[PDB]
Amino acid sequence: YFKIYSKHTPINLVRDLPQGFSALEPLVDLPIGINITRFQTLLALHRS
Amino acid sequence: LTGTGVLTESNKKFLPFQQFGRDIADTTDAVRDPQTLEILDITPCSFGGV
Ligand SMILES: *[C@@H]1O[C@H](CO)[C@@H](O)[C@H](O)[C@H]1NC(C)=O
């Protein structure tokens, strides 16, 4: 069972993590049923 | 979810992933109606000593 908990927070700090409290609400409970041991996030390039 | 209690209109605002609410004794004291999405308090029926 793949649980997605999410929270969006308006911040204005430049570099590091903000110091504060914000609870993450559950968004999507996803029925995959597969083995996960390694992950990788996706970025986007800018071309000019 | 079965039970017996007085149903009143509730001021609690449930998050959309929430269906019911539990008290200290884990009895459902607030519930969302599954047809019209509104919250109801469930006060128990009166108990007395005769
Ligand atoms: C039917 O149930 C849905 C929730 O699943 C609700 O949004 C809708 O208003 C209901 N319609 C009627 C006619 O009760």
CSV table of N, CA, C and O and ligand atoms in Angstrom, one decimal:
chain,number,residue,atom,x,y,z
A,1,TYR,N,0.8,-1.2,0.0
A,1,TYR,CA,0.0,0.0,0.0
A,1,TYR,C,0.9,1.2,0.0
A,1,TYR,O,1.8,1.4,0.9
A,2,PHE,N,0.7,2.1,-1.0
A,2,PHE,CA,1.5,3.3,-1.1
A,2,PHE,C,0.8,4.5,-0.7
A,2,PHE,O,-0.2,5.0,-1.3
A,3,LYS,N,1.2,5.1,0.5
A,3,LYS,CA,0.5,6.2,1.2
A,3,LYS,C,1.1,7.5,0.8
A,3,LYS,O,2.3,7.7,1.0
A,4,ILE,N,0.3,8.5,0.3
A,4,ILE,CA,0.8,9.8,0.0
A,4,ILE,C,0.2,10.8,1.0
A,4,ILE,O,-1.0,11.0,1.0
A,5,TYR,N,1.0,11.4,1.9
A,5,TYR,CA,0.6,12.5,2.8
A,5,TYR,C,1.2,13.8,2.2
A,5,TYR,O,2.3,13.8,1.8
A,6,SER,N,0.4,14.8,2.2
A,6,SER,CA,0.8,16.1,1.6
A,6,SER,C,0.4,17.3,2.4
A,6,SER,O,-0.6,17.3,3.1
A,7,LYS,N,1.2,18.4,2.3
A,7,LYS,CA,0.9,19.7,2.9
A,7,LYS,C,1.6,20.7,2.0
A,7,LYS,O,2.8,20.6,1.7
A,8,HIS,N,0.9,21.8,1.8
A,8,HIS,CA,1.4,23.0,1.1
A,8,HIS,C,1.5,24.1,2.0
A,8,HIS,O,0.5,24.4,2.7
A,9,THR,N,2.7,24.8,2.1
A,9,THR,CA,2.9,25.8,3.1
A,9,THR,C,3.5,27.0,2.4
A,9,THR,O,4.5,26.9,1.7
A,10,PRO,N,2.9,28.2,2.5
A,10,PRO,CA,3.5,29.4,2.0
A,10,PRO,C,4.7,29.9,2.9
A,10,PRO,O,4.5,30.2,4.0
A,11,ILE,N,5.9,29.9,2.3
A,11,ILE,CA,7.1,30.2,3.0
A,11,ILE,C,7.8,31.3,2.2
A,11,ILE,O,7.4,31.6,1.0
A,12,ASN,N,8.7,32.0,2.8
A,12,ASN,CA,9.5,33.1,2.2
A,12,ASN,C,10.9,33.1,2.6
A,12,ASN,O,11.6,34.1,2.5
A,13,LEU,N,11.5,31.9,3.0
A,13,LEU,CA,12.8,31.8,3.4
A,13,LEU,C,13.7,31.4,2.2
A,13,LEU,O,13.3,30.7,1.3
A,14,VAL,N,14.9,31.9,2.2
A,14,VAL,CA,15.7,31.9,1.0
A,14,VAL,C,16.4,30.5,0.8
A,14,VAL,O,16.3,29.9,-0.3
A,15,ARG,N,17.1,30.0,1.8
A,15,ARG,CA,18.1,28.9,1.6
A,15,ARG,C,17.7,27.6,2.3
A,15,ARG,O,17.5,26.6,1.6
A,16,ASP,N,17.4,27.7,3.6
A,16,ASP,CA,17.3,26.4,4.4
A,16,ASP,C,15.8,26.1,4.6
A,16,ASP,O,14.9,26.8,4.1
A,17,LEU,N,15.6,25.1,5.4
A,17,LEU,CA,14.2,24.7,5.8
A,17,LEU,C,13.7,25.8,6.8
A,17,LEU,O,14.4,26.3,7.6
A,18,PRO,N,12.4,26.1,6.6
A,18,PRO,CA,11.8,27.0,7.6
A,18,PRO,C,11.6,26.3,8.9
A,18,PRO,O,11.4,25.1,9.0
A,19,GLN,N,11.5,27.0,10.0
A,19,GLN,CA,11.3,26.5,11.4
A,19,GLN,C,9.8,26.7,11.7
A,19,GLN,O,9.4,27.9,11.9
A,20,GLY,N,9.1,25.7,11.9
A,20,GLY,CA,7.7,25.8,12.2
A,20,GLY,C,7.0,24.5,12.2
A,20,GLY,O,7.6,23.4,12.2
A,21,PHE,N,5.7,24.5,12.3
A,21,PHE,CA,4.9,23.3,12.4
A,21,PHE,C,3.8,23.3,11.3
A,21,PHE,O,3.1,24.3,11.1
A,22,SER,N,3.7,22.2,10.6
A,22,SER,CA,2.7,22.0,9.6
A,22,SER,C,2.4,20.5,9.4
A,22,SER,O,3.3,19.8,8.9
A,23,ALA,N,1.2,20.1,9.7
A,23,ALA,CA,0.8,18.6,9.6
A,23,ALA,C,0.4,18.3,8.2
A,23,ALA,O,-0.3,19.1,7.5
A,24,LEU,N,0.9,17.1,7.7
A,24,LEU,CA,0.7,16.7,6.3
A,24,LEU,C,-0.6,15.9,6.2
A,24,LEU,O,-0.8,14.9,6.9
A,25,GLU,N,-1.6,16.4,5.4
A,25,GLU,CA,-2.8,15.6,5.3
A,25,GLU,C,-2.6,14.5,4.2
A,25,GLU,O,-1.8,14.6,3.3
A,26,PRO,N,-3.2,13.3,4.4
A,26,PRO,CA,-3.1,12.2,3.5
A,26,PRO,C,-3.8,12.6,2.2
A,26,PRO,O,-5.0,13.0,2.2
A,27,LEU,N,-3.1,12.4,1.0
A,27,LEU,CA,-3.7,12.8,-0.3
A,27,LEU,C,-4.2,11.6,-1.1
A,27,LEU,O,-5.4,11.5,-1.4
A,28,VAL,N,-3.4,10.6,-1.4
A,28,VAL,CA,-3.7,9.5,-2.3
A,28,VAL,C,-3.2,8.2,-1.6
A,28,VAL,O,-2.0,8.1,-1.3
A,29,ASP,N,-4.1,7.2,-1.5
A,29,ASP,CA,-3.7,5.8,-1.1
A,29,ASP,C,-3.7,5.0,-2.4
A,29,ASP,O,-4.8,4.8,-3.0
A,30,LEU,N,-2.5,4.5,-2.8
A,30,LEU,CA,-2.3,4.1,-4.2
A,30,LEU,C,-2.0,2.6,-4.2
A,30,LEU,O,-1.1,2.1,-3.5
A,31,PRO,N,-2.8,1.8,-4.9
A,31,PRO,CA,-2.7,0.3,-4.9
A,31,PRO,C,-1.7,-0.3,-5.9
A,31,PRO,O,-2.1,-0.7,-7.0
A,32,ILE,N,-0.5,-0.3,-5.6
A,32,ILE,CA,0.6,-0.8,-6.5
A,32,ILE,C,1.0,-2.2,-6.2
A,32,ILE,O,1.0,-3.0,-7.1
A,33,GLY,N,1.2,-2.6,-5.0
A,33,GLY,CA,1.6,-4.0,-4.6
A,33,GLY,C,3.0,-4.4,-5.2
A,33,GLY,O,3.1,-5.5,-5.7
A,34,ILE,N,4.0,-3.5,-5.2
A,34,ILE,CA,5.3,-3.9,-5.7
A,34,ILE,C,6.4,-3.6,-4.7
A,34,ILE,O,6.1,-2.9,-3.7
A,35,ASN,N,7.5,-4.2,-4.9
A,35,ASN,CA,8.7,-4.0,-4.0
A,35,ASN,C,9.4,-2.7,-4.4
A,35,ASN,O,9.6,-2.4,-5.5
A,36,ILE,N,9.6,-1.9,-3.4
A,36,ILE,CA,10.4,-0.6,-3.5
A,36,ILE,C,11.5,-0.6,-2.5
A,36,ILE,O,11.3,-0.7,-1.3
A,37,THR,N,12.7,-0.5,-3.0
A,37,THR,CA,13.9,-0.3,-2.2
A,37,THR,C,14.7,0.9,-2.6
A,37,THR,O,15.7,1.2,-1.8
A,38,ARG,N,14.5,1.5,-3.7
A,38,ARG,CA,15.3,2.6,-4.2
A,38,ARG,C,14.4,3.5,-5.0
A,38,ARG,O,13.5,3.1,-5.7
A,39,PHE,N,14.7,4.8,-4.9
A,39,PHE,CA,13.8,5.8,-5.6
A,39,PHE,C,14.7,6.9,-6.2
A,39,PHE,O,15.9,7.0,-5.9
A,40,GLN,N,14.1,7.7,-7.1
A,40,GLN,CA,14.8,8.8,-7.7
A,40,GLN,C,13.8,9.9,-8.1
A,40,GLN,O,12.8,9.5,-8.8
A,41,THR,N,14.0,11.1,-7.8
A,41,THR,CA,13.1,12.2,-8.1
A,41,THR,C,13.4,12.8,-9.5
A,41,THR,O,14.5,12.6,-10.0
A,42,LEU,N,12.4,13.4,-10.1
A,42,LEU,CA,12.5,14.0,-11.4
A,42,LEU,C,12.5,15.5,-11.4
A,42,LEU,O,11.7,16.1,-10.8
A,43,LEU,N,13.6,16.0,-12.1
A,43,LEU,CA,13.7,17.5,-12.3
A,43,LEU,C,13.4,17.8,-13.7
A,43,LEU,O,13.1,17.0,-14.6
A,44,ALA,N,13.5,19.1,-14.0
A,44,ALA,CA,13.2,19.6,-15.4
A,44,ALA,C,14.4,20.6,-15.8
A,44,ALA,O,14.8,21.4,-15.1
A,45,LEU,N,14.8,20.4,-17.0
A,45,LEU,CA,15.9,21.2,-17.6
A,45,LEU,C,15.3,22.5,-18.2
A,45,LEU,O,14.1,22.6,-18.5
A,46,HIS,N,16.1,23.5,-18.3
A,46,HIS,CA,15.8,24.7,-19.1
A,46,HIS,C,16.8,24.8,-20.2
A,46,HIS,O,18.0,24.8,-20.0
A,47,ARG,N,16.3,25.0,-21.5
A,47,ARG,CA,17.1,25.0,-22.7
A,47,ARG,C,17.0,26.4,-23.3
A,47,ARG,O,15.9,27.1,-23.3
A,48,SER,N,18.1,26.9,-23.8
A,48,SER,CA,18.2,28.3,-24.4
A,48,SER,C,19.1,28.3,-25.6
A,48,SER,O,20.1,29.0,-25.6
B,1,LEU,N,-21.4,1.1,10.0
B,1,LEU,CA,-21.2,1.5,11.4
B,1,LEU,C,-22.5,1.7,12.1
B,1,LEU,O,-23.2,2.7,11.9
B,2,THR,N,-22.8,0.7,13.0
B,2,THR,CA,-24.1,0.7,13.7
B,2,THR,C,-23.9,1.3,15.1
B,2,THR,O,-22.8,1.4,15.7
B,3,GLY,N,-25.0,1.8,15.7
B,3,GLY,CA,-25.0,2.4,17.0
B,3,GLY,C,-26.4,2.9,17.4
B,3,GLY,O,-27.3,2.8,16.6
B,4,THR,N,-26.5,3.5,18.6
B,4,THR,CA,-27.7,4.1,19.1
B,4,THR,C,-27.3,5.4,19.7
B,4,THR,O,-26.6,5.4,20.7
B,5,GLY,N,-27.8,6.5,19.2
B,5,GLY,CA,-27.6,7.8,19.8
B,5,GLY,C,-28.4,8.9,19.2
B,5,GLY,O,-28.8,8.8,18.0
B,6,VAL,N,-28.5,10.0,19.9
B,6,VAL,CA,-29.2,11.2,19.4
B,6,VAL,C,-28.3,11.9,18.3
B,6,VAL,O,-27.1,12.2,18.6
B,7,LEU,N,-28.9,12.1,17.2
B,7,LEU,CA,-28.1,12.8,16.1
B,7,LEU,C,-28.5,14.3,16.1
B,7,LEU,O,-29.7,14.7,15.9
B,8,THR,N,-27.5,15.1,16.1
B,8,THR,CA,-27.6,16.6,16.1
B,8,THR,C,-26.7,17.2,15.0
B,8,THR,O,-25.7,16.5,14.6
B,9,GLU,N,-27.1,18.3,14.5
B,9,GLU,CA,-26.2,19.0,13.5
B,9,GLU,C,-25.0,19.5,14.2
B,9,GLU,O,-25.0,20.0,15.3
B,10,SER,N,-23.8,19.3,13.5
B,10,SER,CA,-22.5,19.5,14.1
B,10,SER,C,-21.8,20.7,13.6
B,10,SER,O,-21.9,21.0,12.4
B,11,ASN,N,-21.0,21.3,14.5
B,11,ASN,CA,-20.1,22.4,14.1
B,11,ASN,C,-18.7,22.0,13.7
B,11,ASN,O,-17.9,22.8,13.3
B,12,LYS,N,-18.4,20.7,13.9
B,12,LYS,CA,-17.1,20.2,13.5
B,12,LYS,C,-16.9,20.1,12.0
B,12,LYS,O,-17.9,19.8,11.2
B,13,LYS,N,-15.7,20.5,11.5
B,13,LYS,CA,-15.4,20.5,10.1
B,13,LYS,C,-14.4,19.4,9.8
B,13,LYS,O,-13.2,19.5,10.1
B,14,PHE,N,-14.9,18.3,9.1
B,14,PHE,CA,-14.0,17.2,8.8
B,14,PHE,C,-13.2,17.5,7.6
B,14,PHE,O,-13.6,18.1,6.6
B,15,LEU,N,-12.0,17.0,7.6
B,15,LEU,CA,-11.1,16.9,6.4
B,15,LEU,C,-11.7,15.9,5.5
B,15,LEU,O,-12.3,14.9,5.9
B,16,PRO,N,-11.4,16.1,4.1
B,16,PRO,CA,-12.1,15.2,3.2
B,16,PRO,C,-11.7,13.7,3.2
B,16,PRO,O,-12.4,12.8,2.7
B,17,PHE,N,-10.6,13.4,3.9
B,17,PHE,CA,-10.2,12.0,4.1
B,17,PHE,C,-10.8,11.4,5.3
B,17,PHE,O,-10.7,10.2,5.6
B,18,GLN,N,-11.6,12.2,6.1
B,18,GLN,CA,-12.2,11.7,7.3
B,18,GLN,C,-13.7,11.4,7.1
B,18,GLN,O,-14.4,12.1,6.5
B,19,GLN,N,-14.1,10.3,7.7
B,19,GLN,CA,-15.5,9.9,7.6
B,19,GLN,C,-16.2,9.9,8.9
B,19,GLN,O,-17.3,10.4,9.0
B,20,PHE,N,-15.5,9.5,10.0
B,20,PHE,CA,-16.0,9.5,11.3
B,20,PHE,C,-15.1,10.1,12.3
B,20,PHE,O,-13.9,10.3,12.0
B,21,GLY,N,-15.5,10.4,13.5
B,21,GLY,CA,-14.7,10.9,14.6
B,21,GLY,C,-14.9,10.1,15.9
B,21,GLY,O,-16.0,9.6,16.2
B,22,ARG,N,-13.8,9.8,16.6
B,22,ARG,CA,-13.8,9.0,17.8
B,22,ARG,C,-13.5,9.9,19.0
B,22,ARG,O,-12.8,10.9,19.0
B,23,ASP,N,-14.1,9.5,20.1
B,23,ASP,CA,-14.0,10.1,21.4
B,23,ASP,C,-12.8,9.4,22.2
B,23,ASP,O,-12.0,8.7,21.6
B,24,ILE,N,-12.8,9.6,23.5
B,24,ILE,CA,-11.8,9.0,24.4
B,24,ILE,C,-12.0,7.5,24.4
B,24,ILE,O,-11.0,6.7,24.3
B,25,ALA,N,-13.2,7.0,24.4
B,25,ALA,CA,-13.5,5.5,24.5
B,25,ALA,C,-13.6,4.9,23.1
B,25,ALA,O,-14.0,3.7,23.0
B,26,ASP,N,-13.1,5.6,22.0
B,26,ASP,CA,-13.2,5.1,20.6
B,26,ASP,C,-14.6,4.7,20.2
B,26,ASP,O,-14.8,3.8,19.5
B,27,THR,N,-15.6,5.5,20.6
B,27,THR,CA,-16.9,5.4,20.1
B,27,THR,C,-17.1,6.6,19.2
B,27,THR,O,-16.6,7.7,19.4
B,28,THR,N,-17.9,6.3,18.1
B,28,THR,CA,-18.1,7.3,17.1
B,28,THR,C,-19.0,8.4,17.6
B,28,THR,O,-20.3,8.2,17.8
B,29,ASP,N,-18.4,9.6,17.9
B,29,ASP,CA,-19.2,10.7,18.4
B,29,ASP,C,-19.5,11.8,17.3
B,29,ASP,O,-20.3,12.7,17.6
B,30,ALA,N,-18.9,11.6,16.2
B,30,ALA,CA,-19.2,12.5,15.0
B,30,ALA,C,-19.1,11.7,13.8
B,30,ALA,O,-18.2,10.8,13.7
B,31,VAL,N,-20.0,11.9,12.8
B,31,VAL,CA,-20.0,11.1,11.6
B,31,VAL,C,-20.4,12.0,10.4
B,31,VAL,O,-21.1,13.0,10.6
B,32,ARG,N,-19.9,11.6,9.3
B,32,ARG,CA,-20.2,12.3,8.0
B,32,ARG,C,-21.3,11.4,7.3
B,32,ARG,O,-21.1,10.2,7.1
B,33,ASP,N,-22.4,12.1,6.9
B,33,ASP,CA,-23.4,11.3,6.1
B,33,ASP,C,-22.9,11.1,4.7
B,33,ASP,O,-22.5,12.0,4.0
B,34,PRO,N,-23.0,9.8,4.3
B,34,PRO,CA,-22.3,9.4,3.0
B,34,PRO,C,-23.1,9.9,1.8
B,34,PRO,O,-22.5,9.8,0.7
B,35,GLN,N,-24.3,10.4,1.9
B,35,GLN,CA,-25.1,10.9,0.7
B,35,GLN,C,-25.0,12.4,0.6
B,35,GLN,O,-24.6,12.9,-0.4
B,36,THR,N,-25.4,13.1,1.7
B,36,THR,CA,-25.2,14.6,1.8
B,36,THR,C,-24.0,14.8,2.8
B,36,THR,O,-24.2,14.5,3.9
B,37,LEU,N,-22.9,15.3,2.3
B,37,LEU,CA,-21.7,15.4,3.1
B,37,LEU,C,-21.8,16.5,4.1
B,37,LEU,O,-21.3,17.6,4.0
B,38,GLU,N,-22.5,16.1,5.2
B,38,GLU,CA,-22.6,16.9,6.4
B,38,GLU,C,-22.2,16.2,7.7
B,38,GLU,O,-22.3,14.9,7.7
B,39,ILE,N,-21.8,16.9,8.7
B,39,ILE,CA,-21.3,16.3,9.9
B,39,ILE,C,-22.4,16.3,11.0
B,39,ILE,O,-23.2,17.3,11.1
B,40,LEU,N,-22.5,15.2,11.7
B,40,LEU,CA,-23.5,15.1,12.8
B,40,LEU,C,-22.8,14.6,14.1
B,40,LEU,O,-22.1,13.6,14.1
B,41,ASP,N,-23.1,15.3,15.2
B,41,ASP,CA,-22.7,14.8,16.5
B,41,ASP,C,-23.6,13.7,16.9
B,41,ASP,O,-24.8,13.7,16.6
B,42,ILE,N,-23.1,12.7,17.6
B,42,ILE,CA,-23.9,11.6,18.1
B,42,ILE,C,-23.9,11.6,19.6
B,42,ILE,O,-23.1,10.8,20.2
B,43,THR,N,-24.7,12.4,20.3
B,43,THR,CA,-24.8,12.3,21.7
B,43,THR,C,-25.5,11.0,22.1
B,43,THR,O,-26.5,10.7,21.4
B,44,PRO,N,-25.1,10.3,23.1
B,44,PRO,CA,-25.8,9.0,23.5
B,44,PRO,C,-27.2,9.3,24.1
B,44,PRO,O,-27.5,10.4,24.6
B,45,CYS,N,-28.1,8.3,23.9
B,45,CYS,CA,-29.4,8.4,24.5
B,45,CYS,C,-29.3,8.4,26.1
B,45,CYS,O,-28.3,7.9,26.6
B,46,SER,N,-30.2,9.0,26.7
B,46,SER,CA,-30.1,9.3,28.2
B,46,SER,C,-30.1,8.0,29.0
B,46,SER,O,-30.8,7.1,28.7
B,47,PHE,N,-29.2,8.0,30.0
B,47,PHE,CA,-29.0,6.9,30.9
B,47,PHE,C,-29.4,7.4,32.3
B,47,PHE,O,-29.0,8.5,32.7
B,48,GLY,N,-30.1,6.6,33.0
B,48,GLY,CA,-30.5,7.0,34.4
B,48,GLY,C,-30.5,5.8,35.3
B,48,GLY,O,-30.5,4.6,34.9
B,49,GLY,N,-30.5,6.1,36.6
B,49,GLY,CA,-30.6,5.2,37.7
B,49,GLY,C,-31.9,5.2,38.3
B,49,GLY,O,-32.3,6.3,38.8
B,50,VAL,N,-32.7,4.2,38.3
B,50,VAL,CA,-34.0,4.2,38.8
B,50,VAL,C,-34.0,3.8,40.3
B,50,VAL,O,-33.7,2.7,40.7
C,1,LIG,C1,-24.9,10.8,-4.2
C,1,LIG,O1,-23.7,10.6,-3.4
C,1,LIG,C2,-22.6,11.5,-3.7
C,1,LIG,C3,-21.4,11.1,-2.8
C,1,LIG,O2,-20.9,9.8,-3.2
C,1,LIG,C4,-23.1,12.9,-3.4
C,1,LIG,O3,-22.0,13.8,-3.8
C,1,LIG,C5,-24.3,13.2,-4.2
C,1,LIG,O4,-24.8,14.5,-3.9
C,1,LIG,C6,-25.4,12.2,-3.9
C,1,LIG,N1,-26.6,12.5,-4.7
C,1,LIG,C7,-27.9,12.3,-4.3
C,1,LIG,C8,-29.0,12.6,-5.2
C,1,LIG,O5,-28.1,11.9,-3.1
